[PDB]
Amino acid sequence: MVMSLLGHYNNFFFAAHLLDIAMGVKTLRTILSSVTHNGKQLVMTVGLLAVVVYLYTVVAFNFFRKFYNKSEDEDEPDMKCDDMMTCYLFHMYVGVRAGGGIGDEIEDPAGDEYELYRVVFDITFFFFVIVILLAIIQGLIIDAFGELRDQQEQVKEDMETKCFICGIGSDYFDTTPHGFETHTLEEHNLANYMFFLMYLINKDETEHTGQESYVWKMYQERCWDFFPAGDCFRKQYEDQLS
Amino acid sequence: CTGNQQSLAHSRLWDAVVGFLHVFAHMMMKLAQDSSQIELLKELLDLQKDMVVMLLSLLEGNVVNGMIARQMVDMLVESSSNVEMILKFFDMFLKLKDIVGSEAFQDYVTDPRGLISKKDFQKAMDSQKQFTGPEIQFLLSCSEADENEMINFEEFANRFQEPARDIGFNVAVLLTNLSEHVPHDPRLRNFLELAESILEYFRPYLGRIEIMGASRRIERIYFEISETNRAQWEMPQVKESKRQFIFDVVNEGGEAEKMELFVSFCEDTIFEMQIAAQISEPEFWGELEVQRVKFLNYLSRNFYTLRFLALFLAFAINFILLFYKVSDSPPGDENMVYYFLEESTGYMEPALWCLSLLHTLVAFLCIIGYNCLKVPLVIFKREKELARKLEFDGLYITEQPGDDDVKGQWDRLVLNTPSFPSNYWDKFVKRKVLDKHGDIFGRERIAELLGMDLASLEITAHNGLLTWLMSIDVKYQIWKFGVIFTDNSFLYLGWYMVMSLLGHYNNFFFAAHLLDIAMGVKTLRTILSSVTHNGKQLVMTVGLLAVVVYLYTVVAFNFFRKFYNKSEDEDEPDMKCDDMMTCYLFHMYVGVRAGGGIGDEIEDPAGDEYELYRVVFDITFFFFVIVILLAIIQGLIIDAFGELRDQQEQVKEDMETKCFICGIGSDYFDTTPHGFETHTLEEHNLANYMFFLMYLINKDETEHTGQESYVWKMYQERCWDFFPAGDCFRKQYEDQLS
Amino acid sequence: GQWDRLVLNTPSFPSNYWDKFVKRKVLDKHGDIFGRERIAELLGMDLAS
């Protein structure tokens, strides 16, 4: 509301309402639920990137300070490595967007007794910061997609092999043809138990019966011992009496 | 012995205890007054303890529904109105200890000396209304008037505290021993109702195990769990170590050794509790030693608060290192200088020197604290393993070390000094191996090999600063420090200290402490555990890259050497392919960082009869080296993330469908409502078994009972046959008896 | 926990919850061990007087 009110001061504030709403329509939430599932770990990886490039800034600042000449001639005082803050900004802003690490902008390391000391510096930047540290970022989105799916697969394979009220598996009820399907729709049912609570509360406390008042006493005591949890009225009264 | 167990059942012993109970009920309730006969009262309570102890020993190998068990309840029901007074007397004094020393009672004190004259006890008892009206007036008689003004509650509370606890616990054990055995006895049930206060108070201390033995049947055993032991089990360090052990056993471990690993972890946990107990602070050379001992334990207690300081300083030092600058002309073409450029108040140059000094001190305190907190556990874990090999394996008697492992060779130096079990509890490990292998082999050879005192001089007990250096064993200390210096954690802390010392030579070395520490905080380790999980395979892929590019260097060097001209004109001799070493370096350094392979730098292949012979060369570099070989690198991190998760998912799905002691699944126990949840918290429990080992070792070898001594004999033999592993006392004694 | 201490003083605490007798139920459950009038003032319940 406040941003819409702010939109009259400047009409370009209405673009912010395009973002936060279009994500919540029917399916962009699920896609957005992979990025934010590993949200605590996608930030620490960046925090690891901000440390690795710092250690590369220290080495490049003390030993390779002549190679950062971002000018051609008569403009030598550009040298975006002379102070720690600018070298860190250079190594962080255009230090990871390049595909080759930091060797795509630094001048060519010809034979200077440091060519081999710098190739290791350049080729380790490519591996440790780009190939690997940007594969963890893509390795966390992918694992998130496979973790939310397995989370829902377990639910389907847990609600189709158990009663959610008793502990009896679907194999025991399946001796009778369509026994488990009938057992979970007539005897034990979420709706039936829910409709009972809506029935006890609606009914007056003076109109209860022998069984309703017994349950109502337990419900007010928060002692859920009236749920079976070990029997189904077919394992007790009809195990031998059928 | 079964013969003597039944013999006392068909006897008049029950007629003797009932008379003893009758006098005891009315005796202490009458002797407590006037406080002038405590010695007789204390002796009276001593006799009470021996009666229940004998009664407990009468219920050692009892069947679930046995004649002896059925006779003891008959004794108790006819002894009513007497045991209740015993329990009520215990309850009255036990509640006072909780009431005294509390905030509510501390508000009723009137003088700094501390006393309530005659009736402020009733006012104090009215608050926290537990004592009944008759009960509080009885306690005043049980106390002293003290000229109606000087009733000291501090001494009054500590009069019958210890005697009440020992008798009270044994009664609770005896009462619950019968209840868990005879299930259907209405007389016993109503008898337990008036004893509920005793049972409800001793519940946290009453253990329960299901050892199997001495009858080829499952037998319950009860014992006492101390308050200190339970407190140390709930520490975050201990619980985290427990989770690591369970994870290791389920996945890395396996069957036929689970019990062996569990007992080894149990022994390690006990030693950890021993160390943490002796470093707790609460509860002229002599003065100096006292200060040094307290100071050392101060560092050991505050070890993880120092690791958070060595990192905070390394972050603070590296923040002010962001202002460095290089100038040809120094404010205070050689002679390049480095200086701060804060462009603000100069309160940063002194800060760098101040923080550099502090960091070295903190990084030095950590290595001292580690040397007195975790090193003893390492020594205990190595002395124990060596001791179990001399006796049960004869590693230095019959066999020999494999000659390729340094552990076997280095351990030969320690089994010569009279200090070998310095941290291990088993002090008689030298004689035990002598009595186990001294007959087949030379009896004197073992004596000299172990450095044990010679049998000739073993007469079976016929009968300052300078003084320090003959009490130090040279060989043992050399062996001990060799184990410490090869420890991974110690070396990392040692590297941390030397680098901080090196940081004074050049202030930029303090950036290295930013790396190795920030990874180990709470979650960067797990992220770092995906890169290093497939560490052996991420290196071979690179070793495969260094071979594929070599084979491309050979072809490009022999056939495409004119295309590598890295110059425009008048600078033709650049040609970074003329020799193998430079072409390999060119094809390796800028040969894979490019997005297009090697065609992004090589000159354009126009029509030269080799255009089609080089396009295949270029387009295979893009596929085989870049698209595919850099997808394996990203294909190993991703699989690592999905492998560690499945490793932990299995553990959760394996500890919630099994007992970890028996092999019975959760379905069998779930027939009873919440059966598996109750079974894994009362009958079989990791804490209960762990607290038993801490109980057997603490208890003297001469105070054991029929069941404890049987287990202790098996424990010293390393024969873990007393774990059930096939039954749960509900499948045997209650399958039909319920 | 701290912010919820402000509501258990007015005679409108179970405005939406069905259980209207929640003030007396806690009084009959803890008013014996602790001060019977202390619970009355703590909950803002109408005084027994």
Ligand SMILES: Nc1ncnc2c1ncn2[C@@H]1O[C@H](COP(=O)(O)OP(=O)(O)OP(=O)(O)O)[C@@H](O)[C@H]1O
């Ligand atoms: N009371 C119950 N006890 C056990 N399982 C139940 C129960 N109610 C539902 N189920 C499970 O859910 C299945 C069908 O009910 P449910 O409504 O939850 O599923 P759905 O058909 O996918 O959903 P919907 O009817 O909302 O479209 C059953 O086959 C069973 O596996």
Ligand SMILES: Nc1ncnc2c1ncn2[C@@H]1O[C@H](COP(=O)(O)OP(=O)(O)OP(=O)(O)O)[C@@H](O)[C@H]1O
């Ligand atoms: N002795 C045992 N035998 C079998 N399973 C056990 C035993 N002790 C614990 N468990 C398993 O662990 C579960 C709870 O105990 P545990 O402490 O290991 O788990 P947690 O609740 O996740 O941990 P914590 O209490 O440390 O927070 C039980 O439900 C059971 O699955």
